[PDB]
Design a protein around this ligand. Structure first.
Ligand SMILES: Nc1ncnc2c1ncn2[C@@H]1O[C@H](COP(=O)(O)OP(=O)(O)O)[C@@H](O)[C@H]1O
Ligand SMILES: Nc1ncnc2c1ncn2[C@@H]1O[C@H](COP(=O)(O)OP(=O)(O)O)[C@@H](O)[C@H]1O
Lengths: 166, 191, 338, 99, 192, 111, 56, 56, 44
């Protein structure tokens, strides 16, 4: 509801800008975390997509890049950056990205901490180059500049073992 | 030096001593003279296995020339107390205390090897001191004798009178003789 | 869409010795096709896909069951291997490629391609790269896949064809050799090393068939499979084993039998081909020794007929040829009739 | 929060895309009615908890119970409705058939 | 002390003990005075190998001066019980009990080194106490003597009368003489 | 940002973005201001040996050394209209101000 | 040989070469034989970050 | 070789395999199977389409 | 950024039902609301 109201503020009668507030769904597996995301696409008017955090990896490596998340959101948006900026995103299995225990950092974690460092600017809002379709980041001149400032993000994961910590 | 064995499963490979690897299979090794320390260790194994699964049977390999009577009762009472049926297999020999634990196994799950030797005798004890104290200890050991004979008669199925005459002195028995006597159920000749 | 009984009848002609698994596959595949037949789904209630999970030994007929169904009901069929995806790098590109391969046989038609039957094997191997399962489960969930139309030097991003895998039936075959021990520990006596423990490993393999039928999700998690992946595979069909007697039947009973195939090649040559009953068991004996099941049958017979195939054309007036157990062994030469 | 046994029973019937409705719809289009009794529903939820499969396991439990009937229902004729009871859930009893 | 060894397998490098490494290859070492404690360790090794592969044979290396009969008899019954054949090799020497286990090995698989010495004697024991108890223990040891001689005759193939006379006193047998007596089958002079 | 010859974005992409704001005017871009956030992320992981190549980390720092002080950067001519006759624009960063910023987590332990 | 649409080569040209030898006669062309040497060289390889795409 | 290698035992009665008679290219490629070729990188479908195998 | 989380929790309940509520002209937040013991006062 707040997401749609923020779009309604595009008139900007007052200089104040309505910043977004991301959600963090923490729950056990099989509790319907993924189901909640799928049940919203039915009614959601703006483009909505789902992804997996485990596949994502730090830049400069053979695993994947975080910029690919926007590619999936563009498929539903008909590759229209104007409307894609007002979309919503869901990131599953974010628990696997947590830092390993007592890591000296010499290992240079790519699957974990590296992914978090790249997402930081993405969530807060920044122009992110997106390949046109199914292509690796490279000197290719064609790149889609999509701003994530208005693209809400909902990170859902099953933080196994967190109960012991609490 | 006990050897180390590697267990390979889909999850991974783990290294265990020969005794611990067999413990996973509900196999306890009773060996040497019975005493409080060794008996306590066997009791810990029975409780641990009971917790893992209270339905699966537990196997007990007995090879020992008897020992302390009090330590033996702890093992016997523990076996009857826990729900799992404790099987008893005699390897080499089973003296007075070993035989009591052997026959104490669950009915129909008592085995013995063909060349095993089973010996049963009455309790042994002694006390030094005043005559008044001697009478106290003499009555205590005699009560233990009657109690043990009663328990042996129950498992074996022999009459108490028959058990008393036979256990007055050392009575060496063989695997076939034990079957008819009632100490064991069957012999494990081959697989 | 033939009835489940009809599907089993057709499968019986092509495959044998897997009657129980055939029933599970027949009823399950029938419901999925019926769901596709009723794809309109005018009612609000939306039917859910039922993915099958084949658990059987090597060369037991897992792959053959997949394509046989496609032959009955014409639909595109593609195969894949979990070992290929073990790299865990750019898994998305590899999985969508499976759809591209399927589209090649479906004339690059999204509607026709969605009805295809996908098959995967060697699933036990990935269980423990754990990451592949995280990505693989998404494919079974059903997701749109952007695939370029008929290749193309270059095309717009929107031009890429989009195929939804929600309507595609996925069969994740596998061979869990060590799972039998896990089931015995849960069902039979826990002891496996003691005197009383049942270590009668005669290698008959008859007991394993019944034991594998009691497969439950508990044994799968012990094997290393994640619970999320197990949930997306509700239907499970178990193949026990191919018997030596059954191997003899597979040699001649199936429609496109090995003996019939060779007989056909010899028939056009003008010389009749015969296989004695003793010869058939010899091939089965050699095949069982290889441990490759029915796969070895082709190699054994091919080697036996290699020498005669080379020299029989040179020979003239040969009315018929006969094979016996000695010929399969190689000590003897097949009989020649003139 | 994690799901409970009673919640699993509700999930079988209350959701719009409930598993019971899905299987009933599959039977209804075939021309045969289907009915899930309360005793059967509670048993199914217990099986999921027994196997620890969870909410996703509901599909697997229902598949086994209806495996036999689904195979033979098209071949059979004049079947007005099929009924499932708690006994059928464990597998010892055959599925009740109405003509 | 025991020297550690590394086994190279596809899973990765594995640091094994010298004895544990050989146990992986179905090799059991019987060394020293036979007693209840070591016997149970050998029994556990046999049962463990039976589960891994009941078809493959087991090799028991015997180098000991003998010991208790009850403890040694628990190993004999275990060997006969398990399905896999137990091959017995004599290194250095095999006394009364060590020789019984040596000849107890599977037919055709018993071996002996050329310079090994195999000695066999009758059981020896003692008791102190009243005359009534002495009669009980005296009858028991005599039954064991007949029992051991009966089994020894079965494996060697000699008559019970000959074994009884020969085992009345300590008798030392060389590796070739043992072949004729029947205690072993072949001599492992050199690897072929 | 990553070292040259790898999948990650090249360091020179920053100059291209500055040109876009300037309507691909080299003079305006040459006198523009640049900001680089999360500069702390591209740091060696306290491993002076450098056994493995830190393309995303130390590699980025090495490439950036000459850019800050001044280099004749190469970028597409005009919005990547077409590959033929590239004539990559030459931009000198000798007078381009750079403002790096990041949250150095753990620096307190060192100090 | 390389993937279609690349500077290296196209697999479809192999058929055209066979026609040149047979003078483009579809009848006799179908009865021709092909020998693809160095087939193992194109064996599947893992993805490389530096390389744009694995055409071969 | 890794698939068909039985291994060398350590006991007295085991069979020791010296490096001289370890193995050779001859008699080893003859036992090739589709699974080993897949590890090389060949597609399983491609191997299935080539039943005849001539090993030199 | 932590400030946003604190305010979101306090205004979670009111934002959920304030649009549906009728004849509500203003809402007030007090120290008790931040603690969570009391709900924000509604002006009609
Ligand atoms: N209340 C519910 N009603 C119906 N299905 C549910 C419910 N809660 C959970 N589920 C099931 O849970 C599954 C989705 O959960 P899952 O994707 O495993 O979450 P995550 O992947 O985040 O752990 C769906 O298949 C759905 O059927
Ligand atoms: N009943 C049968 N009739 C005919 N051929 C069979 C039968 N069972 C197995 N086969 C043959 O065995 C082969 C096994 O192939 P596949 O299923 O891929 O092996 P795996 O199951 O080990 O992956 C098939 O190609 C098939 O031709």
């Amino acid at each position: 509801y707040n997401h749609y109201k923020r779009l309604r503020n595009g008139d900007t009668s007052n200089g104040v800008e309505l910043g977004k507030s991301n959600i963090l769904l923490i729950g056990p597996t099989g509790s319907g975390k993924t189901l909640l995301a799928e049940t919203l696409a039915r009614l959601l008017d703006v483009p909505f997509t789902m992804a997996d955090a485990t596949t994502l990896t730090e830049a400069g490596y053979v695993g994947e890049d975080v910029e690919n998340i926007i590619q999936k959101l563009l498929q539903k948006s008909d590759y229209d950056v104007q409307k894609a900026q007002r979309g919503i995103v869901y990131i599953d299995e974010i628990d696997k990205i947590s830092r390993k225990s007592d890591n000296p950092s010499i290992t240079r974690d790519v699957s974990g901490e590296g992914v978090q460092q790249a997402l930081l600017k993405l969530i807060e809002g920044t122009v992110a180059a997106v390949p046109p379709q199914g292509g690796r980041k490279h000197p290719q001149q064609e790149f889609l500049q999509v701003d994530t400032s208005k693209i809400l993000f909902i990170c859902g994961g099953a933080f196994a073992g967190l109960d012991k910590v609490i | 030096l006990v050897p180390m064995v590697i267990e390979q499963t889909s999850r991974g490979e783990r290294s265990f001593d020969i005794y611990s690897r067999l413990l996973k299979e509900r196999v306890i090794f009773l060996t040497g003279q019975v005493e409080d320390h060794m008996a306590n260790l066997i009791v810990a194994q029975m409780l641990f296995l009971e917790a893992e699964n209270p339905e699966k049977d537990i196997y007990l390999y007995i090879n020992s020339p008897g020992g302390v009577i009090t330590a033996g009762m702890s093992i016997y009472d523990t076996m009857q107390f826990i729900k799992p049926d404790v099987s008893t297999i005699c390897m080499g020999q089973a003296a007075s205390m070993g035989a009591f634990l052997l026959t104490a196994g669950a009915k129909g799950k008592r085995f013995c090897l063909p060349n095993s030797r089973v010996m049963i005798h009455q309790p042994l004890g002694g006390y030094q001191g005043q005559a008044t104290d001697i009478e106290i200890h003499a009555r205590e050991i005699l009560k233990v004798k009657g109690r043990m004979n009663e328990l042996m008669a129950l498992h074996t199925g022999q009459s108490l009178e028959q058990i008393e005459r036979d256990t007055e002195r050392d009575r060496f028995l063989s695997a076939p003789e034990a079957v008819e006597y009632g100490l064991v159920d069957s012999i494990l000749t081959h697989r | 869409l033939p009835t489940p009984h009809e599907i089993r009848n057709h499968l019986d002609d092509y495959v044998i010795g897997q009657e129980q698994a055939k029933k599970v596959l027949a009823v399950a595949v029938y419901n999925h096709y019926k769901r596709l037949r009723n794809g309109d789904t005018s009612n609000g209630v939306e039917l859910g896909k039922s993915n099958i999970l084949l658990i059987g030994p090597t060369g037991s007929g897992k792959t053959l069951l997949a394509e046989t169904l496609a032959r009955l009901l014409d639909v595109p069929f593609t195969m894949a291997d979990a070992t290929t995806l073990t790299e865990a790098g750019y898994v998305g590109e590899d999985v969508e490629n499976i759809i591209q391969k399927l589209l090649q046989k479906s004339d690059y038609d999204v509607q026709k391609a969605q009805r295809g039957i996908v098959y995967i094997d060697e699933i036990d191997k990935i269980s423990r790269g754990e990451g592949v399962q995280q990505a693989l489960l998404k494919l079974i969930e059903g997701t749109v896949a952007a695939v370029p139309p008929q290749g193309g030097r270059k095309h717009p991003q929107q031009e890429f064809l989009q195929v939804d895998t929600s309507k595609i039936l996925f069969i994740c075959g596998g061979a869990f050799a060590g799972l039998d021990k896990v089931i015995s520990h849960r069902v039979e006596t826990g002891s496996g090393i003691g005197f009383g423990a049942t270590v009668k490993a005669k290698s008959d393999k008859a007991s394993e068939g019944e034991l594998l039928a009691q497969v439950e999700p508990e044994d799968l998690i012990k094997f290393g499979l994640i619970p999320e992946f197990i949930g997306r595979l509700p239907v499970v069909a178990t193949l026990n084993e191919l018997s030596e007697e059954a191997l003899i039947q597979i040699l001649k009973e199936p429609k496109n039998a090995l003996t019939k195939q060779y007989q056909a090649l010899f028939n056009l040559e003008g010389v009749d081909l015969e296989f004695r009953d003793e010869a058939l068991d010899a091939i089965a004996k050699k095949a069982m020794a290889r441990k490759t099941g029915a796969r070895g049958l082709r190699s054994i017979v091919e080697a036996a007929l290699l020498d005669t195939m080379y020299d029989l054309p040179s020979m003239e007036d040969v009315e018929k040829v006969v094979i016996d157990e000695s010929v399969i062994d190689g000590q003897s030469e097949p009989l020649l009739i003139y």
